[PDB]
Design a protein around this ligand. Structure first.
Ligand SMILES: *[C@@H]1O[C@H](CO)[C@@H](O[C@@H]2O[C@H](CO)[C@@H](O[C@@H]3O[C@H](CO[C@H]4O[C@H](CO)[C@@H](O)[C@H](O[C@H]5O[C@H](CO)[C@@H](O)[C@H](O)[C@@H]5O)[C@@H]4O)[C@@H](O)[C@H](O)[C@@H]3O)[C@H](O)[C@H]2NC(C)=O)[C@H](O)[C@H]1NC(C)=O
Ligand SMILES: *[C@H]1O[C@H](CO)[C@@H](O)[C@H](O)[C@@H]1O
Ligand SMILES: [Cl-]
Length: 279
């Protein structure tokens, strides 16, 4: 029920690893200058970019034959996730006015991630509607890594709830917790079969903010283990007890900025342009 912890055993990874590998390149490219004429990443053409990862996360919008209009959100450290949890960035708050009317009463979201999404949301919705129309494209995929993965989860819900035609898929890498148990179960209800959370190895970022602050993940993730390998399993349900805490975390960004199905998401340190499938 709300706030529970699944005990089910893991199963083989059922997700499309080609799609994951592509999505990892589409988001890695958001850590890079994306102003080039006609840039191509994997099967995708870049249509639009905004922001530079200093004041706001860079957002890149692509068209892809496999993912549709793909919106990728950078996750550079505009604030630190390893900081004092009493600070205001980690407080829970109501949904922003733009979408509160779509959510169950009692939904809460983390301030730092919600505010950063709210800075971008109307420009994202305008650009996605623009490019869906230009490309006769019904499918919208939202992709994010690190802080951009929690922003990406909020954006993927916003598209499903408020944009005509809803969401196709979301691919989220190294996803922090974002909302409370009401939120997590609503994600399952609205986008559960479109949701893909990928965690690599010993990454600590999916453990923060902690459950003791009222935060809960949606159901399911695929854990690549060992980190950077091609071996992965799906851990079903919310907060599966058999998953990542069974292997001690690392407290650096090595696996967080690791290899996801042959594509490195090295972040600012990484590959520019991104290289789908290169590892
Ligand atoms: C999963 O993959 C990620 C990368 O996507 C790994 O993250 C990196 O982790 C390392 C620590 O293990 C961090 O430390 C820095 O690494 C820098 C990169 O060093 C490699 O590449 C160099 C350039 O090609 C190369 O010269 C270097 O080789 C030298 O050092 C080796 C030991 O480190 C030694 O074995 C070699 O023979 C040679 O002397 C490395 O191959 C390095 O420049 C820094 O000095 C520092 O050590 C990186 O910052 C992390 N990268 C990112 C993007 O965060 C992660 O560790 C992988 N996970 C696992 C479990 O291995
Ligand atoms: C995990 O284990 C619990 C009991 O600990 C079961 O109720 C559940 O179905 C799953 O097997
Ligand atoms: Cl910026």
């Amino acid at each position: 029920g709300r706030g529970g912890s699944s005990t089910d055993q893991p199963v083989a990874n059922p997700y499309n690893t080609k799609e994951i590998s592509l999505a990892a390149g589409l988001v890695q490219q958001t850590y890079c200058d994306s102003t080039e004429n006609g840039l191509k990443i994997g099967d995708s053409e870049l249509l639009y970019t905004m922001g530079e990862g200093y004041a706001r996360q860079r957002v890149n919008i692509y068209h892809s034959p496999s993912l549709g209009i793909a919106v990728a959100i950078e996750g550079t450290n505009l604030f630190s996730l390893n900081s004092d949890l009493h600070d205001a960035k980690f407080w829970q708050e109501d949904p922003n006015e733009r979408y509160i009317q779509y959510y169950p009463k009692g939904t809460k979201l983390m301030h730092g991630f919600q505010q950063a999404y709210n800075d971008l949301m109307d420009d994202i919705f305008t650009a996605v509607k623009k490019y869906k129309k230009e490309k006769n494209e019904k499918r919208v995929t939202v992709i994010g890594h690190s802080l951009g993965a929690a922003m990406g989860l909020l954006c993927a819900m916003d598209i499903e709830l408020r944009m005509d035609g809803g969401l196709y898929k979301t691919y989220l890498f190294g996803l922090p917790r974002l909302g409370n148990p009401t939120f997590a179960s609503f994600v399952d209800q609205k986008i559960g079969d479109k949701f893909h959370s990928i965690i690599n190895g010993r990454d600590w970022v999916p453990t923060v903010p902690p459950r003791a602050l009222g935060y809960q993940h949606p159901s399911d993730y695929v854990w690549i283990y060992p980190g950077n390998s091609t071996s992965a399993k799906l851990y079903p349900g919310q907060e599966n007890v058999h998953g990542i805490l069974t292997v001690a975390r690392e407290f650096n960004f090595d696996d967080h900025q690791g290899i996801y199905f042959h594509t490195q998401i090295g972040a600012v340190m990484g590959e520019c342009p991104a290289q789908v499938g290169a590892h």
